Design a binder for this molecule. Structure first.
Ligand code: GTP
Ligand code: GTP
Lengths: 50, 83, 50, 49, 438, 438
């Protein structure tokens, strides 16, 4: 029966990327311009000093 | 009288007989019977003993089956209309 | 959201393991070199006694 | 030789950490989601409406 | 299914593949050991790796590529690298004798006894594959071993396998920089051989690659790793359609059908728009419009050709990341209505859009940007003939004074095949203006 | 019931046999003492050993194999070995005079007074046996004591017992390697004597056995222990049908009825597919497909013959391990679809598949692979005539200048018998051509 549960688990993955995709729908709303991009450069500018 | 069966040359005579002898660089390698000491006689002749060999050829390469791309600005048939 | 958080934590833990083994192998190599050097050092001491 | 001894102390700390972390990963990677699969479905949670 | 095989020839062609497969292991989270963590992704080899790796029951992701060289120097060191356990030892086909930049020596002297070995690899890789859309040929025109050996094998894989695609990628010779003066010899030798057999040959020139680095990436001091990263990013971008999905999914078959207008000429130009230093995109914004302006900005191309000196035929754009059709169709509508971009009148539309939702991810210890909206701009224009025009006047002099011929006639070649290529080349240019001429 | 008899002639034919029961005792767990643990497997001699060993009420597994030798050197050292307590003293037939590589010396001078004694072993083994399907003859064409002695005894066992099979196994003469120049003499003598009596003669060659070793087994310096291990594995696989069962069970009679097309020619080729190093098997995968491709790869055969130089008649597959009909029948169907594989049009089907569930086990102190799916490739083709045509051009050279004849005419022969063998051979290739000609 566990195989029926894993195909339930991957469906639980599908709904969540749908939860994610609506997040990415609102991410695109934010990604008019985003902010985690700012966070990324901090490490990039950090290592550049190194 | 049994005729000797014509020795079938499934290559062999052609290849394997000549293949044994061909991959052989012998009569050469450990050393000669002696070094033929070059008596002071001569050397090459005014820049002789060269490798230059200008050949003459035009040999065709394989076939580009790939046919001509254009029709050199020509026409197919269009515009056939009937009232 | 519970399931998502669990998955993220597990991934971080795996990364930590990777770093650990990375350190271990070079520790191994370094100690081997150190031992060989100290043996050469005793030999040099006797040679100097000569 | 002192530095050498310090090196073995470092490595022994390392392997103890290895064992601890391996145990933790086994536990959480095994028990949780395997039991979590039993989570019911939305319609029967709606009561077979 | 949707899988292919990559090939790496020429001593240059193997370090580039290394970085590509180095890049490829990151997006799949491949540990250098060869296995996934306790996470359930291993099986009958059918997952995101099935199109790229072969992670069979042993759990080891086997890359679907064969690395071929003739000098053991580089291949032994990578055999002592970090992922050498991943790489199959005899897929790293090594050699003991070089081609000495000689196309023919790499085509006649040693290639005969080695191709049978690699052909065994091909068929033993052919049998395990299922869909096998085509091949990835990584090489170089100025191939120290790339020129001669690739030419023979691509002939051999063509004759037995003529029903699938063959994708060619080589560094275009630098227009004014030459690390070899015999490089023109084999380069035109390679081109004329491949024209009737190569399916899609894609080029690149390193000078403008360096020029980009200190233009926008602000790196006045880059490295091959950086160069390999961006070409590795380039091939990663075109292969993301195989990896992930998007609004629509497109394949090399569509690429082939829609990009090449007519036979022979199959030499478009790739380009990646969001090439910027991280700190520059830090306080600025990137969107579809400006990257479209940037991707069509003439100095952003890696090939020394002015598009205003030529005319456009085809353009393929591949948006990887988060996009919406609304701005995409509007922006290109502005682009289609742009005056300076001189498309040939023969094509009403020439635009092949590819959409992939997955954002391009960074590489640890990298240098690139932080991209949400990425596009690889593949395009074909008439401004390319100048390069071959640059090539011929170089060759016509040096051939007329027949330099280095003693080398090639010494090892058994002769002038006729050299003669053939020039009108074969002259055929190439004379085709280029007539397609330009409406 | 299901049993057979083993015969070992030639001083080099005994160490190879020695390994067999060294191998055989492992998969049965036979202790070198000669007894199992206290667990109840003893009786009148009826269990997995009953087909091979004779563990009577005394409880000692007695191998059903007579080792005949003409020099007490190697037979006594193994008589001082590890399993000598298992072995019957005078079943280990020792000898006091050599044949000096002379066929007729072992066939006339000394074989007379020895064959009567060894025949006593055969009948005293025959009487205790019940079904005794056939005989296992291990020898060598360059048999210093194999060639001459076997020829006489095989004649004698043929005339008294013509109602049962006799299976012959000899190292084929090394094609381009000759450790003895008289070898073409006695070899052609053996062949013409055996053509009208031998049931099924199977050949192997040492060179290709080593060639495999440093190709995929990755051993640049193996030993006889490995070489004997490989062939001992081969005979173990063919005897697994006697030992264990499978999806279907086959017998040497089926092998005989279906392999030999017509009288005379009974000389197929055997091969083992899963030949790989332990580590290579570790991070790779085994399945029916690739081993089917590997087993039909031309360089995996142990005989210096190009299959594309000839054409196929029969192919027998002995799948030992876990396989299903589905992939097996699908894979062979694709093999039938292959065009390079050239079976003779006389046989639409020539496929004899054998399935055995038991996985091939490893040997302690061994170097073999990890086998879950094995197959033994018994196959006969027309590309075999090269071997004899290699012998005759050698032989016709010496015979015209009649070297070493003073040795042979010295101890009592003439040239007529040497004459017969040449047209006896000349029949073979003229038979080979006609069967080769469709
Ligand atoms: N794409 C790419 N090209 C390179 C790289 N390094 C050098 N090159 C250039 O590409 C050419 C490679 O051709 P070759 O030099 O003949 O290399 P090869 O045929 O593999 O073998 P060699 O003769 O030993 O060098 C060189 O002439 C360089 O100018 C690199 O890392 N990547
Ligand atoms: N069958 C077999 N042959 C071997 C082995 N090792 C080497 N050989 C070769 O096989 C040949 C064995 O035949 P012979 O030399 O005639 O041996 P013999 O007939 O038992 O008696 P001798 O003439 O005394 O050696 C040798 O010449 C070797 O070249 C082995 O382990 N088994």
């Amino acid at each position: 029966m566990s195989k029926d549960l894993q195909q339930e688990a991957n469906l639980a993955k599908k709904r969540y990327i749908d939860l994610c995709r609506q997040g990415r729908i609102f991410d695109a709303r934010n990604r008019i311009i985003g902010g985690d991009t700012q966070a990324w450069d901090f490490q990039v500018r950090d290592q550049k000093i190194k | 009288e049994p005729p000797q069966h014509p020795r079938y040359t499934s290559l062999f005579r052609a290849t394997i007989k000549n293949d044994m002898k061909k991959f052989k660089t012998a009569m050469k390698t450990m050393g000669p019977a002696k070094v033929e000491i070059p008596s002071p006689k001569d050397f090459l002749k005014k820049h002789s003993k060269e490798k230059t060999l200008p050949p003459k050829k035009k040999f065709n390469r394989c076939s580009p089956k790939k046919p001509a791309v254009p029709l050199r600005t020509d026409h197919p048939v269009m515009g056939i209309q009937s009232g | 959201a519970v399931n998502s958080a669990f998955s993220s934590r597990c991934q971080e833990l795996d990364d930590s393991l990777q770093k650990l083994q990375y350190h271990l192998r070079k520790t191994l190599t370094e100690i081997t070199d150190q031992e060989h050097q100290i043996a050469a050092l005793k030999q040099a001491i006797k040679d100097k006694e000569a | 030789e002192q530095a050498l001894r310090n090196l073995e102390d470092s490595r022994m700390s390392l392997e103890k950490d290895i064992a601890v972390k391996t145990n933790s990963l086994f536990i959480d990677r095994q028990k949780c989601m395997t039991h979590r699969n039993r989570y019911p479905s939305v319609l029967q949670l709606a009561g077979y409406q | 299914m949707r899988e292919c095989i990559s090939i790496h020839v020429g001593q240059a062609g193997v370090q580039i593949g290394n970085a590509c497969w180095e890049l490829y292991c990151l997006e799949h989270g491949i540990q250098p050991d060869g296995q996934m963590p306790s996470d359930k992704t291993i099986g009958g080899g059918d997952d995101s790796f099935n199109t790229f790796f072969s992670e069979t029951g042993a759990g080891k992701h086997v890359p679907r590529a064969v690395f071929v060289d003739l000098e053991p120097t580089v291949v032994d060191e990578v055999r002592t690298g970090t992922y050498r356990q991943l790489f199959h030892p005899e897929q790293l086909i090594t050699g003991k004798e070089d081609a000495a930049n000689n196309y023919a020596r790499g085509h006649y002297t040693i290639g005969k006894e080695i191709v049978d070995l690699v052909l065994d690899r091909i068929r033993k890789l052919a049998d395990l594959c299922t869909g096998l859309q085509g091949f990835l040929i990584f090489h170089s025109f100025g191939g120290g071993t790339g020129s001669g050996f690739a030419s023979l094998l691509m002939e051999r894989l063509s004759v037995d396998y003529g029903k699938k695609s063959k994708l060619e990628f080589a560094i275009y010779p630098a227009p004014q920089v030459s690390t070899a003066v015999v490089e023109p010899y084999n380069s035109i030798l390679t081109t004329h051989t491949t024209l009737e057999h190569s399916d899609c040959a894609f080029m690149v020139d390193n000078e403008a690659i360096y020029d980009i680095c200190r233009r926008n990436l602000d790196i006045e001091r880059p490295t091959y790793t950086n160069l390999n990263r961006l070409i590795g990013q380039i091939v990663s971008s075109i292969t993301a359609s195989l990896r992930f999905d998007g609004a629509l999914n497109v394949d090399l078959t569509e690429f082939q059908t829609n990009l090449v207008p007519y036979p022979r000429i199959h030499f478009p130009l790739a380009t990646y728009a969001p090439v910027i230093s991280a700190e520059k995109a830090y306080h600025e914004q990137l969107s579809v419009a400006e990257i479209t302006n940037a991707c069509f900005e003439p100095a952003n191309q890696m090939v020394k050709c002015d598009p205003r000196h030529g005319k456009y035929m085809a353009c393929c754009m591949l948006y990887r990341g988060d996009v919406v059709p609304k701005d995409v169709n509007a922006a290109i509508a502005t682009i289609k209505t742009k005056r300076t971009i001189q498309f040939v009148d023969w094509c009403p539309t020439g635009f092949k859009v590819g959409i992939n939702y997955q954002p391009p991810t960074v590489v640890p210890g990298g240098d690139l940007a932080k991209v949400q909206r990425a596009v690889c701009m593949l395009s074909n224009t008439t401004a390319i003939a100048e390069a071959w025009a640059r090539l011929d006047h170089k060759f016509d002099l040096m051939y007329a004074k027949r330099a280095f011929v003693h080398w090639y006639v010494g090892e058994g070649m002769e002038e006729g095949e050299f003669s053939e290529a020039r009108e074969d080349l002259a055929a190439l240019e004379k085709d280029y203006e007539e397609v330009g001429v409406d």
